[PDB]
């Protein structure tokens, strides 16, 4: 599964306004590469990778000239350092979560103005088409999404009235969502990823405070267990997994837009500061793929 030359890509984000940055971190030498800007600035987007291509999904352009929720899907090819537009989603989705199953991108939840989506749709890259699938049991903006064992998990978020500790799982062969065990902590805007047999939820916002706590859901035992907390509390953070470790990037803590990047080692149950982003920002999309040419 591991291979050389993979970078952690961070796209978009927010600081004073929505951002167009695409930057890639190399854990093997600690360097950051500045790559081609997004065609449209966006925060609250999600990033994912299919077939070596990086996709930026949804979000919102918060600019001095207005606030526009995004239905856009855009594809970055590291071999060309170019972004290419794809077919748009059926609805704008800010503060979205995405997951990849069998080469298809699932776009989950998000907001459009005051509308809080429970709807979900799936993108087929070979056909460049989106199609709706079964909606979630709960409306979720700021939802964390991860895929484990070809099952799709939607974790936490905000339904428009309450931030959520609930979570649910999508079973593709049944086109059905079912609730799973609720988290120990209410979390909107948490970083959600998969490591070994567990879904991790790191940080987020409980309606009062941004969080440094981290918990993981064992899909076998169906229990949530706290692990070591991050050094810096953060919500609306970027997250990914690389070579058996969790990386959290940026976010907002109620006082600062963080540039901090922390790395979690599950064998030692410890977080370590590895690098800083070029500037502090929240609401980024993050994914791992091969380095550009």
Rule CB under 6 A: say whether 142 interacts with ligand T6I: yes
Rule CB under 6 A: say whether 213 interacts with ligand T6I: no
Cβ of residue 15: shortest distance to ligand T6I, in angstroms? 9
**Position of tokens 């594809």?**
75
E-strand ranges in 27-162 read: 31-34, 46-50, 53-57, 60-63, 66-69, 73-77, 82-85, 97-101, 104-108, 111-112, 115-116, 120-124, 129-133, 144-148, 151-158
Contact characters 13-52, ligand T6I, x per CB under 6 A: -x-----------------------------x--------
Binders of ligand T6I in range 229-288 (CB under 6 A):
235-236, 252, 282-283
Other Cβ atoms less than 10 A from the Cβ of 124: the count is: 13
Cβ of residue 211: shortest distance to ligand T6I, in angstroms? 9
DSSP string, 198-240: EEEEE--B-SS-B---EEEEETTTTEEEEEPPPSS--BS-EEE
Rule CB under 6 A: say whether 95 interacts with ligand T6I: yes
Rule CB under 6 A: say whether 76 interacts with ligand T6I: no
Distance separating alpha carbons of residues 264 and 269, to the nearest angstrom: 7
Q: What are phi and psi of 227, to 5 degrees?
A: -110, -170
Among residues 200 and 205, whose Cβ is nearest to ligand T6I? Answer: 205
Among residues 158 and 271, whose Cβ is nearest to ligand T6I? Answer: 158
Rule CB under 6 A: say whether 210 interacts with ligand T6I: yes
Residues near ligand T6I (CB under 6 A) are 14, 44, 95, 141-142, 158, 163, 188-189, 205, 210, 235-236, 252, 282-283
């Amino acid at each position: 599964a591991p291979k050389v030359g993979r970078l952690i890509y961070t796209a978009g984000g927010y600081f004073r306004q929505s951002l167009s940055y695409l930057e890639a971190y190399n854990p093997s030498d600690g360097t950051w590469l500045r790559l081609a800007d997004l065609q449209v600035p966006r925060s609250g987007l999600a990033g994912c990778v299919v077939g070596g291509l990086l996709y930026a999904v949804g979000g919102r352009n918060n600019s001095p000239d207005g606030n526009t929720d995004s239905s856009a899907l855009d594809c970055y090819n590291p071999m060309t350092n170019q972004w290419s537009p794809c077919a748009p989603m059926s609805v704008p989705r800010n503060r979205i979560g995405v997951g990849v199953i069998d080469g298809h991108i699932y776009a989950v939840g998000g907001s459009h103005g005051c509308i809080h989506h429970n709807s979900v749709e799936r993108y087929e890259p070979e056909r460049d088409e989106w199609h709706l699938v079964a909606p979630m049991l709960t409306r979720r903006i700021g939802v964390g999404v991860a895929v484990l064992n070809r099952l799709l998990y939607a974790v936490g978020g905000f339904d428009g009235t309450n931030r959520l500790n609930s979570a649910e799982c999508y079973y593709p062969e049944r086109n059905e969502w079912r609730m799973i065990t609720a988290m120990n902590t209410i979390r909107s805007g948490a970083g959600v990823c998969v490591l070994h047999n567990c879904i991790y939820a790191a940080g987020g916002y409980d309606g009062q405070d941004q969080l440094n706590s981290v918990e993981r859901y064992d899909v076998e035992t169906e229990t949530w267990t706290f692990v070591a907390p991050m050094k810096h509390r953060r919500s609306a953070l970027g997250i990914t997994v690389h070579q058996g470790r969790i990386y959290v990037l940026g976010g907002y803590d109620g006082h600062t837009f963080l540039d901090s990047v922390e790395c979690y080692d599950p064998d030692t149950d410890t977080w370590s500061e590895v690098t800083r982003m070029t500037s502090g920002r929240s609401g980024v999309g993050v994914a791992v793929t091969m380095e550009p040419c």
